[PDB]
Design a binder for this molecule. Sequence first.
Ligand SMILES: *[C@@H]1O[C@H](CO)[C@@H](O[C@@H]2O[C@H](CO)[C@@H](O)[C@H](O)[C@H]2NC(C)=O)[C@H](O)[C@H]1NC(C)=O
Ligand SMILES: *[C@@H]1O[C@H](CO)[C@@H](O[C@@H]2O[C@H](CO)[C@@H](O)[C@H](O)[C@H]2NC(C)=O)[C@H](O)[C@H]1NC(C)=O
Ligand SMILES: *[C@@H]1O[C@H](CO)[C@@H](O[C@@H]2O[C@H](CO)[C@@H](O)[C@H](O)[C@H]2NC(C)=O)[C@H](O)[C@H]1NC(C)=O
Ligand SMILES: *[C@@H]1O[C@H](CO)[C@@H](O[C@@H]2O[C@H](CO)[C@@H](O)[C@H](O)[C@H]2NC(C)=O)[C@H](O)[C@H]1NC(C)=O
Ligand SMILES: *[C@@H]1O[C@H](CO)[C@@H](O[C@@H]2O[C@H](CO)[C@@H](O)[C@H](O)[C@H]2NC(C)=O)[C@H](O)[C@H]1NC(C)=O
Ligand SMILES: *[C@@H]1O[C@H](CO)[C@@H](O)[C@H](O)[C@H]1NC(C)=O
Ligand SMILES: *[C@@H]1O[C@H](CO)[C@@H](O)[C@H](O)[C@H]1NC(C)=O
Lengths: 50, 170, 99, 50, 49
Amino acid sequence: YTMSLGAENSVAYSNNSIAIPTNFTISVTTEILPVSMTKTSVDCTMYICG
Amino acid sequence: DSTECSNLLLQYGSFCTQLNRALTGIAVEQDKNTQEVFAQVKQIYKTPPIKDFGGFNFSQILPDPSKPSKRSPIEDLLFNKVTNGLTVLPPLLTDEMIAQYTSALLAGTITSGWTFGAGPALQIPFPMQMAYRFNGIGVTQNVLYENQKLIANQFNSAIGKIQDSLSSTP
Amino acid sequence: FCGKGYHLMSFPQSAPHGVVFLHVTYVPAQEKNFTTAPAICHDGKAHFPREGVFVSNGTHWFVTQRNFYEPQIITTDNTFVSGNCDVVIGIVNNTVYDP
Amino acid sequence: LTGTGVLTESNKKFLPFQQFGRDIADTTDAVRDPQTLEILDITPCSFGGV
Amino acid sequence: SALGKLQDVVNQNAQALNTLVKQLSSNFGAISSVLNDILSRLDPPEAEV
Ligand SMILES: *[C@@H]1O[C@H](CO)[C@@H](O[C@@H]2O[C@H](CO)[C@@H](O)[C@H](O)[C@H]2NC(C)=O)[C@H](O)[C@H]1NC(C)=O
Ligand SMILES: *[C@@H]1O[C@H](CO)[C@@H](O[C@@H]2O[C@H](CO)[C@@H](O)[C@H](O)[C@H]2NC(C)=O)[C@H](O)[C@H]1NC(C)=O
Ligand SMILES: *[C@@H]1O[C@H](CO)[C@@H](O[C@@H]2O[C@H](CO)[C@@H](O)[C@H](O)[C@H]2NC(C)=O)[C@H](O)[C@H]1NC(C)=O
Ligand SMILES: *[C@@H]1O[C@H](CO)[C@@H](O[C@@H]2O[C@H](CO)[C@@H](O)[C@H](O)[C@H]2NC(C)=O)[C@H](O)[C@H]1NC(C)=O
Ligand SMILES: *[C@@H]1O[C@H](CO)[C@@H](O[C@@H]2O[C@H](CO)[C@@H](O)[C@H](O)[C@H]2NC(C)=O)[C@H](O)[C@H]1NC(C)=O
Ligand SMILES: *[C@@H]1O[C@H](CO)[C@@H](O)[C@H](O)[C@H]1NC(C)=O
Ligand SMILES: *[C@@H]1O[C@H](CO)[C@@H](O)[C@H](O)[C@H]1NC(C)=O
């Protein structure tokens, strides 16, 4: 299929109308960020030659 | 297509697998980059058919209905100004879908300000939105309202100068 | 930068070779249409909201904060005066209360 | 087949056509003794960073 | 797949190490991939090659 970018949302714009929220949601989201890698050391002489 | 060459190449091990894996990682990283830049909204916002924004003109940045590529005149000028086992993989997002994403972002920031980036898109008149932006930089709303025709004219002139500067600089 | 929505706070959590941020954000919800005006014309003077916005429920005009509906009577304490009514485009006539 | 490693008694059971066993790096990690047919693991001698 | 970002880093490091150890099994055009076989089978003038 051709992938849908998203749902269409025509904002009801006019020159004298505003939308004011009457309520709120306290939303908690996760963000995972890598920090470090495994500290690996390779003996070049022992790797190549044993 | 030489079989003897590939038989000798197998003596070197999995170098070719490493190079193909690195190139595949680069190829998927480009699509991830395009997703991270352009696909920040899950709603495809559209401008109203009547372009009454209190004197503010966005025709040079809104998509042109007469063009089949559905690009803005600025974006059309930008696309005109950019010109043995090898393959070129096409990007996951084509240019018209990237233009549709930018059009959705433009419609959201014109009709709703910064509200669509923090939740539901809340409509607001564009001069009032500009006044809010004026208060963000520490200038009172009255200054914006009193000099609204001048601000709209300066904005339209600057957008036209942007198009002229892009069309006149190689 | 710190989650989707208006950022309130964040909490860090350790992870194997990584960090997990629990971003606590404020999301607006249950929005309602209102008729808005840039300024209020009263006694030949233009009144602008000091921190909020002029809203109308259909018959009456109020001033409320921008991110939450909390309608209040348009007074001289939450508005400021700049110029007359001849300059601002879209100014409407409404009374301004004096405490 | 020459090498250097710690020899331990092994739990692996070789098939009779098998003499040695190889690891990922194709080093002999298990061997059958050619006189008394028993299996021995060959763990390598300890390697350290000074 | 919630913690996939850390798991990709761990998998890439383990895969790089695994491929590094797999490279020891290649002879790179020599008669054998084992040094001990070459030292036991050949005189030093061909063993140096
Ligand atoms: C604010 O008013 C507008 C227009 O009166 C509403 O937009 C309409 O919404 C209905 C149902 O969602 C649609 O069938 C119409 O096509 C919309 N019209 C336009 C012009 O967009 C909008 O829903 C109202 N907002 C609220 C919060 O009530
Ligand atoms: C704002 O939204 C909250 C939901 O987050 C509403 O709280 C709910 O109210 C209904 C009816 O009063 C209850 O059945 C639910 O149990 C409530 N949920 C919670 C989590 O408390 C609240 O009523 C809304 N307020 C307004 C003014 O719309
Ligand atoms: C917004 O800007 C566009 C372009 O700057 C205006 O379109 C011009 O309109 C005049 C007269 O209508 C024409 O002579 C030009 O050729 C048009 N330019 C282009 C590039 O098409 C437009 O009139 C402005 N105003 C509105 C309300 O759209
Ligand atoms: C707009 O809000 C005002 C104030 O909240 C409403 O005025 C009140 O309406 C109630 C309900 O009929 C009356 O009991 C009060 O006496 C009214 N107060 C005043 C000072 O008149 C008004 O009705 C609202 N308008 C709409 C269309 O909802
Ligand atoms: C808002 O109030 C002003 C002033 O009371 C109104 O302006 C007057 O309008 C009448 C008839 O249109 C004229 O005869 C007066 O000369 C005007 N006075 C001034 C000072 O301009 C205005 O019409 C009102 N507007 C609305 C929408 O109610
Ligand atoms: C808003 O548009 C209407 C026409 O739809 C017009 O009558 C009115 O004067 C406009 N108001 C402003 C402030 O531009
Ligand atoms: C001699 O070697 C054979 C294997 O070839 C084995 O079966 C036998 O037990 C060995 N005998 C002695 C005395 O080591």
